Design an enzyme around this catalytic site. Structure first.
Site, mmCIF file in Angstrom:
data_model
loop_
_atom_site.group_PDB
_atom_site.id
_atom_site.type_symbol
_atom_site.label_atom_id
_atom_site.label_comp_id
_atom_site.label_asym_id
_atom_site.label_seq_id
_atom_site.Cartn_x
_atom_site.Cartn_y
_atom_site.Cartn_z
ATOM 1 C CG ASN B 8 -0.420 23.590 59.456
ATOM 2 O OD1 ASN B 8 -0.476 24.833 60.375
ATOM 3 N ND2 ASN B 8 -1.614 22.801 59.767
ATOM 4 C CE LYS B 10 -0.198 19.927 61.969
ATOM 5 N NZ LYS B 10 -0.607 18.541 62.330
ATOM 6 C CG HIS B 94 -4.903 20.574 58.823
ATOM 7 N ND1 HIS B 94 -5.068 19.730 59.776
ATOM 8 C CD2 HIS B 94 -3.763 20.501 58.299
ATOM 9 C CE1 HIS B 94 -3.848 19.305 60.048
ATOM 10 N NE2 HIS B 94 -3.192 19.749 59.061
ATOM 11 C CD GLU B 96 -4.033 19.117 63.163
ATOM 12 O OE1 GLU B 96 -4.032 20.341 63.188
ATOM 13 O OE2 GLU B 96 -3.026 18.168 63.334
ATOM 14 C CD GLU B 164 -1.623 17.412 55.900
ATOM 15 O OE1 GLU B 164 -2.522 18.012 56.753
ATOM 16 O OE2 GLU B 164 -0.411 17.824 55.996
ATOM 17 N N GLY B 170 1.130 13.453 62.773
ATOM 18 C CA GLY B 170 1.305 13.580 64.006
ATOM 19 C C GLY B 170 2.165 12.170 64.636
ATOM 20 C CB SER B 210 4.991 11.419 59.400
ATOM 21 O OG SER B 210 4.298 11.509 60.658
HETATM 22 CL CL LIG Z 1 2.432 15.412 60.664
HETATM 23 CL CL LIG Z 2 0.024 20.000 58.402
#
Ligand SMILES: [Cl-]
Ligand SMILES: [Cl-]
Ligand SMILES: [Cl-]
Lengths: 241, 246
Positions: B8, B10, B94, B96, B164, B170, B210
């Site tokens: 991904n 992003k 996702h 986000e 995730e 992140g 991560s």
């Molecule tokens: Cl990540």
């Molecule tokens: Cl991701």
């Protein structure tokens, strides 16, 4: 003020249909870049395609961008991405994003400021709903939406009034709102911003209804919806004269 | 279950950087398509460029699409638009977008359902917040996000579930192999007991958050960990080492 006509393709298009639109735009005869400013706005996934095929005297807009620099924002597209790809314009605050994607007044405001600081030119959209108009809050709503963009920003903005409430929408009703919006700019930002900022009309514009709207003194052009996908988009451009 | 590695990108990339990333991927030596299924996910504006440039034995995903058919949705990209451009995958739900763009559990499920019926394959993301894990709520939250997706379709064959944990996105804080194995096996039991044994046996469940070249090997050894969804490392040559953990 230079007449301005933007074509918002919205969430429409295939490669085939995009090719026919662009070929039709490429073969049309319209006023010169000194008499009308033309922007067309395809979905993200076709921006590079239209950019490399469309006549260069028309400019390209993205339909949206992110509120700040790129990074960990899955699904979003940053202003610097558009600039890297040679896209000069962006539409921000369109009624469909304010309504269906719940973009707040201040969110739109932050988006406009960030695109402007990066070097995009912005068609910033405002507009009141049916219930808001029936309640008599047209101007209070439109003023609050414009204020949230001003609280944060003027040369590279075009303002687009969308009569989201429309129902028959008359040229006189368009002129009332456009003249009231320009007075707001005059009183809150400055008379030079008011005299120079293009305020375009975004109410179901067609080849068949554009001429009487375009003669109104405070209507500076159009943000065209469904007709931007059609050959009659060219007739709307020609209403500049 | 075929090992699956998604990348991904992003909201990242320039024309120059995207070409460099693709050239690095094109020159890589990785396991065969029988051993690993690799998907890379550029921003919308680069999808057709990457489709032209990328080695055809890797596949491409969009990072989002709209919840229903196209029309008057300024700014949105429809599932049928992606199919038209030859993009076979989409990442949906996702964290986000669930958090910063307020996509609800059922909204994500409705999007998954529509993307599937238009022909797209879907990486569907689930995962708990820090506070939810710390309160002991992890599998209640993940099961609920999963149910809200799986209860909207009658055919689950082209879903890949990506677990995730939000606190791993992140942050430099990866789940341990034990933590990932616990979630992935308990989630697979949920599919087994609430959807069906065949779906549980075949649905890839991949870990994200991560993931690095240095920690991917031990994660990949866990039996219910079927691969990875990779964030920032997907922009780096390190992505190849994660693919090779297959
Ligand atoms: Cl990540
Ligand atoms: Cl991701
Ligand atoms: Cl727990």
């Amino acid at each position: 003020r230079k007449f301005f006509v933007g074509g918002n393709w919205k969430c429409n298009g295939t490669a085939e249909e995009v090719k026919k639109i662009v070929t039709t735009l490429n073969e049309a005869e319209v006023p010169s870049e000194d008499d009308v400013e033309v922007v067309v706005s395809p979905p993200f996934v076709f921006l590079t395609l239209v950019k490399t095929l469309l006549r260069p005297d028309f400019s390209i807009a993205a339909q949206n961008c992110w509120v700040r620099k790129g990074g960990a924002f899955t699904g979003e597209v940053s202003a610097e991405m558009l600039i890297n790809l040679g896209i000069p314009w962006v539409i921000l605050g369109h009624s469909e994003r304010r309504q269906l994607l719940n973009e707040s007044d201040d969110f739109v405001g932050d988006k406009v400021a960030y695109a402007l600081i990066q070097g995009l030119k912005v068609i910033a959209c405002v507009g009141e709903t049916l219930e808001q108009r029936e309640s008599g809050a047209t101007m209070k709503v439109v003023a609050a939406q414009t204020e949230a963009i001003f609280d944060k920003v003027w040369s590279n903005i075009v303002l687009a009034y969308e009569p989201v409430w429309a129902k028959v929408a008359t040229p006189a009703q368009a002129q009332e709102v456009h003249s009231e919006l320009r007075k707001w700019l005059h009183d809150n930002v400055g008379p030079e911003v008011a005299a120079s900022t293009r305020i375009i009309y975004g109410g179901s514009v067609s080849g068949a209804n554009c001429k009487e709207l375009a003669t109104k003194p405070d209507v500076d052009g159009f943000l065209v919806g469904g007709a931007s996908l059609k050959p009659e988009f060219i007739e709307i451009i020609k209403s500049a004269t």
